Design an enzyme around this catalytic site. Structure first.
Site, short mmCIF file in Angstrom:
data_model
loop_
_atom_site.label_atom_id
_atom_site.label_comp_id
_atom_site.label_asym_id
_atom_site.label_seq_id
_atom_site.Cartn_x
_atom_site.Cartn_y
_atom_site.Cartn_z
N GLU A 201 0.88 -1.16 0.00
CA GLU A 201 0.00 0.00 0.00
C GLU A 201 0.92 1.21 0.00
O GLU A 201 1.94 1.19 0.67
CB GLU A 201 -0.87 -0.03 1.26
CG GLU A 201 -1.51 1.30 1.64
CD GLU A 201 -2.40 1.19 2.87
OE1 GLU A 201 -2.74 2.24 3.46
OE2 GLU A 201 -2.76 0.05 3.25
N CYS B 268 -0.18 -13.35 -15.20
CA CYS B 268 0.12 -12.91 -16.56
C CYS B 268 -1.09 -12.46 -17.39
O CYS B 268 -0.93 -12.05 -18.54
CB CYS B 268 0.89 -13.99 -17.32
SG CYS B 268 2.50 -14.39 -16.59
C1 LIG Z 1 1.30 -23.20 -22.81
C2 LIG Z 1 1.21 -23.39 -21.33
C3 LIG Z 1 1.67 -22.42 -20.49
C4 LIG Z 1 1.31 -22.43 -19.05
C5 LIG Z 1 1.44 -21.05 -18.49
C6 LIG Z 1 1.79 -20.88 -17.19
C7 LIG Z 1 1.75 -19.53 -16.56
C8 LIG Z 1 2.92 -18.70 -16.97
C9 LIG Z 1 3.79 -18.14 -15.89
O1 LIG Z 1 4.18 -18.87 -14.98
C10 LIG Z 1 4.18 -16.70 -15.91
O2 LIG Z 1 4.44 -16.35 -17.21
C11 LIG Z 1 3.08 -15.83 -15.42
C12 LIG Z 1 1.79 -16.48 -15.08
N1 LIG Z 1 1.78 -17.74 -14.42
O3 LIG Z 1 0.72 -15.97 -15.36
C1 LIG Z 2 -10.13 11.05 8.07
C2 LIG Z 2 -8.90 11.28 7.27
C3 LIG Z 2 -8.22 10.21 6.74
C4 LIG Z 2 -6.85 10.39 6.20
C5 LIG Z 2 -6.35 9.10 5.64
C6 LIG Z 2 -5.58 8.27 6.41
C7 LIG Z 2 -4.94 7.07 5.81
C8 LIG Z 2 -5.55 5.83 6.38
C9 LIG Z 2 -4.69 4.62 6.49
O1 LIG Z 2 -3.48 4.73 6.58
C10 LIG Z 2 -5.31 3.26 6.46
O2 LIG Z 2 -6.43 3.28 7.25
C11 LIG Z 2 -5.70 2.84 5.08
C12 LIG Z 2 -5.34 3.68 3.89
N1 LIG Z 2 -4.27 4.63 3.95
O3 LIG Z 2 -5.95 3.54 2.84
#
Ligand SMILES: C/C=C/C/C=C/CCC(=O)[C@@H](O)CC(N)=O
Ligand SMILES: C/C=C/C/C=C/CCC(=O)[C@@H](O)CC(N)=O
EC number: 2.3.3.20
Lengths: 344, 326
Positions: free
Chosen positions: A103, A129
């Site tokens: 975050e 992917c």
């Molecule tokens: C043709 C078969 C392929 C199988 C694919 C597997 C996933 C590929 C990867 O491992 C990375 O490229 C990213 C992903 N998993 O999305």
């Molecule tokens: C009321 C005013 C709020 C100001 C914002 C503060 C950030 C809040 C946090 O730090 C977490 O709760 C989640 C987030 N940042 O999204």
């Protein structure tokens, strides 16, 4: 006989597209030099990277380049390609596997860098992917409805850390055969970035159209490829087998909703895992290999940025002509499979 | 322009089982408080967080999300086979890949038509997920969606306490790490559906988003967040027809007592319309909003026709406000 839309997107276009190649080349020859004592201990005699996977080099950034930086570079380039200013963007979605922080979103960081307006909606989508296509679909739904005029989908991938830590682990005198095999696929990854500006078609009449498409899943296979910032473990054998089975199922849906027949498509932009996975995919569906551009040999697997990088490269190479029917296909960890169409 | 055919079919929350009190935490921080001479109870007396909950060891975000999902399905009285989309919105995630959503979906046994992915957007993500699901439902792509969010903070507590307790740390570094000790564990899930499938269910109208991403780099969060919220509320007046006295509940992200009171003061909102759980559960990130909505439902606080504002100020900065009509 009047038919339905099959829920494909209407009046959604691609206004601009760009890719960034990372600057530093790391050859498989150099990697093999580092791995050779471990290869020898394990009795490995084949060049599993260069000859089996078919990857000869991949690109890396400097250590201090974050996903958001690479994404920002691609975004500025896509804005130029679309000839629009950042002020026109109403939605920015980041789809990368690489992430600056838990975050806030990488999207907010890219948006801050680019200077988006206070109307711009931003968030990250994570889906291995396939995420760039997911991002295109989410943007498309908003654009079709006319809630926004322009969207940016961005994706920067940094594999530096996974390379560094994997190469250290795989060169340990104590590394097991099982762990060596488990992590080998990490050495097929590459750095790079892509970004796309999408728009309501009425704004860009001559631009390519994005139709959307179909998705099927096999989430019982969610353990096959697991990755964190410094490590990726993959069951390549089952990924191949179960991936192809899922794509077959997905292709049946594509024929039904997109009306696809392989001979009538002009380009297949496929996510690329390796030379043998690609060969299997092409043989399974009887696709003409000439329709399948690959960058894996010199850039490796750029995760969810792969598809748009390959599409951008096809554009730049002047391989795409008006009317061309372009299939975007991917099998992503999950497992998920998505198949969508662009008409150039 | 607002969603006409999107409803909430079911909703649930899971409370984490282990209590860690601020009194307990303070006993551990006391020497470091003493060094640097704090002498103030920032957690209990300033932030107003007296306790938070932790999961059992080795509970992952996906596990917590799965527990919430099962309970939301029961609340909706539907089987998993009906779910066409499952989005995970948590900050906590099992891995970078695959999505935490795929793992939850695998645990539940979703069908091969079920689309899954994660959305990440700090504490605003659950609202983003609802929006994304709403658009798919409205277009007729799916009939039911699950939006799930499990948050884990066990590891953050272990690491942070040890770090802020170490010789090098300045005041400010320490005061920044104190913020981490306001996080809590918990989970929620919501089933959304096409309205014609669930007459009488609450309806999701949609909402508005404004941003100030120039602040993506606590006291600052407060002021600028509220300014952003003010801009977002102006937009909400126009697109949603919002006026404070016409809203029955404000369901807001749960950050701290001072932050909540500043929000209430700014908008002139009746604090009776703002349920809080920070006191005993801390800040549950993007799960806070749906946990509070779920508690309001279970408590019988919501009646047919109630106009409910969902809103958060998230890291970014982003601000989203949406309406549900019960
Ligand atoms: C043709 C078969 C392929 C199988 C694919 C597997 C996933 C590929 C990867 O491992 C990375 O490229 C990213 C992903 N998993 O999305
Ligand atoms: C009321 C005013 C709020 C100001 C914002 C503060 C950030 C809040 C946090 O730090 C977490 O709760 C989640 C987030 N940042 O999204």
């Amino acid at each position: 006989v009047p038919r339905g839309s099959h829920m494909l997107f209407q009046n959604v276009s691609i206004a601009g597209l760009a890719h960034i190649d990372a600057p530093h080349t790391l050859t498989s020859k150099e990697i093999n030099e580092r791995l050779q004592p471990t290869y020898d201990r394990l009795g490995i005699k084949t060049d599993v990277l260069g000859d089996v996977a078919g990857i000869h080099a991949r690109r890396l950034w400097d250590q201090d380049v974050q996903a958001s930086d690479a994404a920002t570079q691609a975004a500025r380039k896509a804005l130029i390609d679309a000839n629009i200013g950042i002020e026109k963007i109403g939605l920015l979605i980041n789809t990368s596997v690489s992430r600056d922080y838990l975050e806030p979103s990488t999207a907010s960081i890219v948006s801050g860098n680019l200077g988006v307006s206070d109307h711009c909606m931003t968030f990250d989508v994570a889906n291995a992917c396939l995420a760039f296509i997911n991002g295109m679909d989410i943007a498309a739904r908003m654009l079709e409805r006319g809630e926004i005029d322009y969207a940016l989908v961005v994706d920067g991938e940094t594999a530096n850390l996974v390379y560094e830590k994997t190469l250290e682990r795989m060169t340990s005198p104590d590394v097991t055969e099982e762990e060596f095999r488990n992590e080998l696929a990490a050495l097929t990854l590459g750095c790079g970035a892509a970004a796309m500006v999408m728009a309501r078609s009425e704004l860009v009449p001559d631009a390519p159209r994005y139709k959307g498409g179909v998705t099927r899943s096999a989430t019982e296979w969610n353990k096959l490829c697991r990755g964190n910032l410094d490590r990726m473990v993959t069951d390549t054998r089952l990924l191949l087998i179960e991936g192809i089975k899922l794509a077959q199922k997905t292709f049946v849906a594509a024929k039904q909703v997109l009306g696809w027949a392989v001979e009538e498509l002009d380009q297949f932009v496929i996510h690329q895992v390796s030379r043998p996975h690609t060969a299997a995919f092409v043989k399974s569906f009887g696709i003409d290999p000439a329709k399948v551009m690959t960058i894996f040999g010199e850039h490796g697997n750029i995760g969810p940025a792969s598809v748009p990088i390959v599409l951008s490269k096809l554009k730049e190479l002047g391989r795409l002509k008006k009317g061309d029917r372009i299939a975007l296909l991917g099998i992503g960890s999950g497992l998920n499979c998505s198949m969508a169409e662009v008409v150039w």
